[model samples]
Target chain A: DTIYLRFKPDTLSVVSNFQPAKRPMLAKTYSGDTLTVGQGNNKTAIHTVVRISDPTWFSADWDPISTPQPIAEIYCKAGTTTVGDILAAYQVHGLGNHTTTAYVVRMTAGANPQVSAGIVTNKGTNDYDLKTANSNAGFSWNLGSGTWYLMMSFGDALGSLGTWRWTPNELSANYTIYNCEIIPCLLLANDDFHIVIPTKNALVPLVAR
Target chain B: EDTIYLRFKPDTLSVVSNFQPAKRPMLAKTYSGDTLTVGQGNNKTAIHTVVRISDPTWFSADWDPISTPQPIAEIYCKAGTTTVGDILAAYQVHGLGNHTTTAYVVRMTAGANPQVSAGIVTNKGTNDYDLKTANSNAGFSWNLGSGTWYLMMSFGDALGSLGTWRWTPNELSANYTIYNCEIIPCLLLANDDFHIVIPTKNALVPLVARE
Candidate 1:
């Protein structure tokens, strides 16, 4: 059986009233929480990972204040196993003057899932900080056997240095693997970002009858 | 397209008494309060403590007063009703900074209503009162009695160094009353989260079947 998973944003809303060169500024990476599912009585294991890409450069003027913009991603997958396992990983990376910049990652499950990687820059110049470049590894098994479908999300964040200034650099999320069938992963990228593709098996040559 | 017709009545709470809550003048050293009753000192009663000073560096409302004038705090009150231009009357008096003062009388009726106005209570005084006149360096508290009323205080800087600030009272009505409880929104000083209620069973199901 083959599995092809697709993930897309649920909603994207941005408030563009940033006063450039005056208020504090920042570059941020926001993570949506993870979704999980059960495998029932089957001995099938599923792993899922998600990668995000920015099609075009998103720009806004900073007046020394941090402006907030949010977007959400939902996953959908197709596979044969009625029962499979699933897991999600998240990371945020950026480069800029972030001495006062802050990064935070929050999730639903796991103890102390909330973490702050701390400030990235102080002089508000060229600098990079891994606000929350952490990983959350999860595992689960089916208690009552049957076919199962899975979906989960993990939340993450990158905070701006309040009353300071920074610009949007670049951001991308690399998922190790998505749960269930180990099919080769497919990816699409734009000018500012890229994704990792899963490799293990090769395609079969076209057969003629 | 077709339209449906129905008879309806136009009724809404009007300005029964549009009284501009009174404003008191600024003085060097002062202590005073106003006794106000709803329906013009008739029904609901409240005692308001008002103060002002000339030394712009003495005001403190949000956090605490530092070396200079922090900010001046202003208070306002209003009474609204369902009837239009109903009869309403109000009065205001100011006292602060060198004993400078001003007053106003507001009236509300069918058209020409009595409207009370006050304020512009700029502190013209120079000398700062002793720390004794100023309460504790710590934050102070106000005890509001049982009656349901609107209360708000705004901080403004007289020196033009900081700027004017204001906070408006939320207009809550009966429809918004959640089983007798009004929704009060407050700023969260720290981080927080909200939980959503999910069903006991799985909500997502595969629409297409595969073998």
Candidate 2:
């Protein structure tokens, strides 16, 4: 039986803006006059720049200095006896310059079945350096039993250049036993880009045949 | 029933360089005064001579100034239910003196649906151009159901000349199904040069049959 693996980007919504507070009312002080409290007479308070038209400016939802975490998931069903050899292709981009991001590939069978690759950016430029294992030699696991599952995780580079996206490679897995059958399965994980941790999952069982 | 083991290796592939050494014409002498004679003083008359420069020099064959063919790397997909999820392209750039402003782009296209995944390298360096598989936003993946697919690599040189080697397609067809291949001016870098050079060895593996 021939098995194909599919990857899709996990939808991420920016929940808040990084907008700093404008001139807020100062607390009442014993020596301060009541008429000067609500007015812009507070000399000790610093007024931040506020723009009503610019949604991203100073809004908490988008932080130009903070890195954003983008996640993607890969799903496939396991066959009987042997799971077969897998082939994949994909690309990543839009991360911050001079930043290094780690990509981890994990299986449901074990925690150590995880294989990792790194993408490093050059200073002052968008050129990214991809470091991985040799040809036909990437992260893989040996599974003789149990339902097979795979997960991919990465920390997206944040900051003004942090808005990023990744494209996981297409995969092909050939089974040793002909006509091997598989059932539906699901895998889940959590990704933390800033303060928010989002749970991502993949539902499998649908076949292209 | 026969069970086939299919393995697709995008690695172990190399692109042909775009640099070619050629001779160009150069003026050997400049006449400051008005020319009145071409042969002897009495019977000579003013005539124009076609002066040619014979110095062999390196030129930016792929850049806009020269507009030459850019170098390219290619791969093929066999007959199977293959999903081309991502592509990784790596290479080294040299011969450019201090000017590191060139751009490298790799595009993966499916002939049937004609979908494309294009990635760019803006940071220039003398080391390897290590491009890896990205997520869907930066690239593209498609379910190539039982047909042939191709991966092509190209680069833009804004500074100096580019070099490449040649490869054959017949050997590649023996391993993977090569329906067709082509080379044209790059869509992203329209001003630069572009060319495709087939690999020498048959690095493609045979397609595994399904029962």
Give the top-scoring candidate (lDDT): 2
Write the residue-wise lDDT of candidate 2 on B86-185 in tens digits: 2222122221231111111122233222222332122212121211111212322222222222233222222223332211111010111101111111
RMSD of 2: 27.4
Off by over 4 Å in 1: A1-72, A75-209, B1-41, B45-183, B187-211
For candidate 2, write residues A56-107 as lDDT tens digits.
Answer: 1111221222211222232222221112111221112222322211121222
lDDT of 1 at A90: 18
Q: What is the per-residue lDDT of model 1 for residues B30-131, given as tens digits with 9 covering 90 to 100?
A: 112221212322222121122111111211222122232111112123223311111111111111121111111111222212121221121101111000
Query: What value of lDDT does candidate 2 attain over all alpha carbons?
Result: 0.18
Model 2 chain B: ten consecutive residues of lowest lDDT: B170-179
- Candidate with maximal DockQ: 2
Residue B150 of model 1 has an lDDT of 18
